[PDB]
Amino acid sequence: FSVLKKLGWFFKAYWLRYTIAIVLLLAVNVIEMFPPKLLGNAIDDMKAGAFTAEGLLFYIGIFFVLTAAVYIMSYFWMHQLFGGANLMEKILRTKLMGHLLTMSPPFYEKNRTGDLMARGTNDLQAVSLTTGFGILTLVDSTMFMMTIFLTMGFLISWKLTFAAIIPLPVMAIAISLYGSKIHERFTEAQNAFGALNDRVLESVSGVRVIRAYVQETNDVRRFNEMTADVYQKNMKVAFIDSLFEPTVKLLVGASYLIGLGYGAFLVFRNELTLGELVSFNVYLGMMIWPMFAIGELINVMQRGNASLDRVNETLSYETDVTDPKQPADLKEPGDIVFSHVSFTYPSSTSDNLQDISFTVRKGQTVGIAGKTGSGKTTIIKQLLRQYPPGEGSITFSGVPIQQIPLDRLRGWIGYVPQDHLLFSRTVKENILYGKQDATDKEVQQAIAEAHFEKDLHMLPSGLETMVGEKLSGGQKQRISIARALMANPEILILDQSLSAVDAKTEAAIIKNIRENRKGKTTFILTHRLSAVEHADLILVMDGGVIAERGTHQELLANNGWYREQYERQQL
Amino acid sequence: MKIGKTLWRYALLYRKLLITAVLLLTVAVGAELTGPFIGKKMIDDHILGIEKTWYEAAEKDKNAVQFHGVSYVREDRLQEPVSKAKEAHIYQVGMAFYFVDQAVSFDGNRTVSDGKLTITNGDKSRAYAAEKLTKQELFQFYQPEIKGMVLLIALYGGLLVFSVFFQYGQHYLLQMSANRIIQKMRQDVFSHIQKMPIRYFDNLPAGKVVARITNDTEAIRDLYVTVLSTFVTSGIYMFGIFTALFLLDVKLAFVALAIVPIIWLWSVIYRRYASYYNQKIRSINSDINAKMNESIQGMTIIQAFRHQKETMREFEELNESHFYFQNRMLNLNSLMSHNLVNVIRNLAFVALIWHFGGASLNAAGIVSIGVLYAFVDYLNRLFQPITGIVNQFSKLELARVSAGRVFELLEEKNTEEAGEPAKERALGRVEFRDVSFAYQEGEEVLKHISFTAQKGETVALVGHTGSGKSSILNLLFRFYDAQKGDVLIDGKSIYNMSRQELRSHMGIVLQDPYLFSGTIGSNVSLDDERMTEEEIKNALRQVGAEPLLKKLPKGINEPVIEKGSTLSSGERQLISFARALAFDPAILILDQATAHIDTETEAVIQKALDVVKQGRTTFVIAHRLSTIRNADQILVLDKGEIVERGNHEELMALEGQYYQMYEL
């Protein structure tokens, strides 16, 4: 079982608990093998003339003692084992989320959200089940089975044991084959049921179309046809599922019958006694559970193995895309200066930014405009360390962006992405997200600066209500702006953050932000060119390259690109 | 109502299959539990037969054994012949068998000193000369019993195979009953869905409707399988085993019956704790999944703000809680389940030893080792299903709530009773009489809307967002009832014609064209089964370029399985238009409030409209107030009330809202 070898760290880390569990399990096997032989001995000593009240009392006391010992030691060893499984689950979950938190957007481009959830919700289950239940089934199948076999062979007979054991291997093989076929047919039935769910989704999503064309009878006809198909698949499943109990009953009754009849014959030959015969049956009655276990063992191990690989496939082999390097002693950002940068995305065959070189000084404000798809946001993607370095050089003061540690860089920047993004928590928590719950008095200032106060007083207090799991594009943009502003960032990046609010509102927001932040940089990106009017630098992006570097007046006097000229083009 | 009553009612259908399966199960249970009874008769009568008295008999006698020079025959086999005195015996002392060619009064502690057998029962009964039966001689006292043993073994095997056949039959038929009940229930629920108001669908997410239709029905299937296969099976099995026990012994059978309360109490307590632990595990696991999801989608903000430490801390809080409750569940499953099963089994062994040892010490010759063996086997059979029983008992609640959901869906009273299409054409005319529409209550969305449209097509209805245009669309199709005024199509009130009759006239084209998975032709035809090869109606819409582009949309290509995402939005709209033309309605309605333009696709869309509006009364709720330039009659909606009523030129000649919008 390669799963256990691959899982060596857990066992080496937790060795005492597993040694305790294994030792107690062998001991429990030994002390559970006794009561059957004791019952047989009571029967035998009964038939012989030697039997008194002292022997009866001895048997009763010893049975109570062994019952208590088995119960207590079982509680302890399997508490240990299954707690080890639970601990493995917890360790894998914490490890998985920790690995996720260190990953960059490229990892999520390569890994779908469902697949990550699939791993973290099924492969962890499989690996923990291996850890505990697969260990239990392995040790049972291997040691418990041989222990019962040997106890039969030595303390009863080797002639009855080999004879009355033939059925059980056959039973185990048949059970494994039935498990395989039932799993296959169950997958088929699940496919059919999923098809039914898909259809029932279309006919509830497209209710109006169906009803507007009086097709609410052919819809029922199709639904009935696929319900019949699902029934047929479930029937194919049940056909092979009904072979388990008949086969177990047949092949266990055959073993019981062989034991009983051949032991009667052996008694006739004086090679065996009545009590022994009873004991033998009890042993068989406790050798059936191992048989099932065998199959289960194989199953879980295989799953474990596969599952673990997938976990390890997207838990270790994916290294960080960005990392700090040799922290440079730069306390505050200076003047951002791109030097012929270029940035092709991992999933792009084009440069996506060609020899882009522009400079920003402290307290300066930058405006980026251009056609859709003109790397407007891509530029600031080069300033958040979300992707490989690119080319050229971004140097705050003189030090290249790589040298600055990621933590310090991300402490400088205040980022407001164009895509509205808020978490399931309260609005106040989203605002505190900038400082991570440091103080609350500045929340009012942040709300006022973004002009969200008017939009904050039209919902119930409710801890500033909740977002995500429980309300407007403009409101969302304003709360994101307040969150970014709460950081008091030295560099504030707004990316089409006011496309939802009106021109008056966005102009007021830009004015207030610029006034409050005088000595700190501010990138503004917007299709609406009226929000970058006051910026002292504007450069329009067209594909990979810039086209219209200059001030608002310079660009007005250079070329007519949107501006006020096309503002009334649609009006 | 009650979910139990409803489940029993739905089972009463297929009651015949249930009865068949139950009778097969009873046959199997009897032909199974009889196996251990053969062993009791293969031991007490055959093996322990030598323990019974022997009498002298002649050699010619059948089933007579020659020990030294005298033939002896067992008392039970003695029958009428050779019924006399001078009995013999074969007693057991230690591991040896001793012949007593003499009558013995009592039985008790047997000791052999030297060719003597002293039996003591608290009064030192007597001593008798004893001989040893060696091995061959003792075996000769057993040879007569070989043939009956063979017969009993053959009976065991035959009854085994017979019971096995019937076990397969009963399980298969129980599964068949469950699946057929579930299929019928699904059909009933979906049919009831087709007769539900559009209000229900509007005020409830689709994923919840699909859930209640399908996933809760699968839960009901699991509940039926549980009940039939576990509860009924094990109840009948225990009934049979207790019958067998009372057949064997009554007092020990009562001791065995003293565990029904054990099972009941085990189930009660295990459920009491496991429901709590499992609910906590489920809620915390759902929380963990939600946290991992929101962090995966949003990590750029988890990292851009250095919130990684805090999000990890919260996830670890949830992880610790989940681990703690999992360990509590482990402690429960250790104090109960297989451990308590084994403890009860050993208590059973103790009870057997106590009872039979005491009976022996009474020295009444009532050992009956066969009874003990059969009891051991019956108790081992009895203990097998307890763990499954308790697991199912704990898990019943989820199925209970799912059944409640599905039955609440089934038992809705407010439904639409219709299904009568229109047998004649509409001719395309419609009128409104101050229809006062309020969605929920009080808050009116269309106040005194009164207008009339004639066979002339292209009647545009424009206005600002949230004005009442889609409410008008809903009223036209009777998705909702205006609860005031009236709407007349061709002079007939829509409230006095079957909803199917009404909708048989009017086609619909919406902002989001619903492209049901299937072929393009099946998408245009909606698998109506009456549409012939009339997909040229698409060619009327001028789709022609695309069928050349694609393999064969005319009922032979299936590019819609992906919801049409691969296809362009213009192509989706054109397919919806083709469907509208193919169904050849009379009162067409166009809800195209989509603010987007979908560059240049509008072009073909316009062409498409130009080929459909002819010979209908085309309502158009398209935006941009430019597609409606030539519309026969514009109508501006605001405040749920028609304020300006006139043509394009007339409205542009009076300024107002229409002029204001036109400039924008």
Ligand SMILES: CCOc1ccc(-c2nc3ccc(-c4nc5ccc(N6CCN(C)CC6)cc5[nH]4)cc3[nH]2)cc1
């Ligand atoms: C005879 C005297 O002694 C007896 C010996 C055994 C049994 C016995 N009765 C049984 C009833 C059911 C099962 C059983 N329950 C199962 C649940 C699930 C599965 N699966 C699911 C499908 N695939 C994956 C395979 C495993 C198998 C299962 N097999 C086992 C059983 N064993 C009864 C008496």
Ligand SMILES: Nc1ncnc2c1ncn2[C@@H]1O[C@H](COP(=O)(O)OP(=O)(O)OP(=O)(O)O)[C@@H](O)[C@H]1O
């Ligand atoms: N995740 C990505 N993977 C690959 N290429 C991408 C990715 N995101 C963007 N691109 C490329 O970048 C081009 C535009 O980049 P970006 O979206 O950053 O700027 P923009 O569209 O001009 O502005 P904005 O994002 O403000 O709308 C897209 O056309 C695409 O070529």
Ligand SMILES: Nc1ncnc2c1ncn2[C@@H]1O[C@H](COP(=O)(O)OP(=O)(O)OP(=O)(O)O)[C@@H](O)[C@H]1O
């Ligand atoms: N199912 C409903 N229940 C209650 N109110 C609704 C419902 N559907 C829509 N409304 C509201 O009723 C009013 C009527 O708007 P309507 O649905 O007719 O849309 P519309 O004005 O045509 O919008 P659009 O700008 O998309 O064209 C709006 O406030 C709308 O939000």
Ligand SMILES: [Mg+2]
């Ligand atoms: Mg609308």
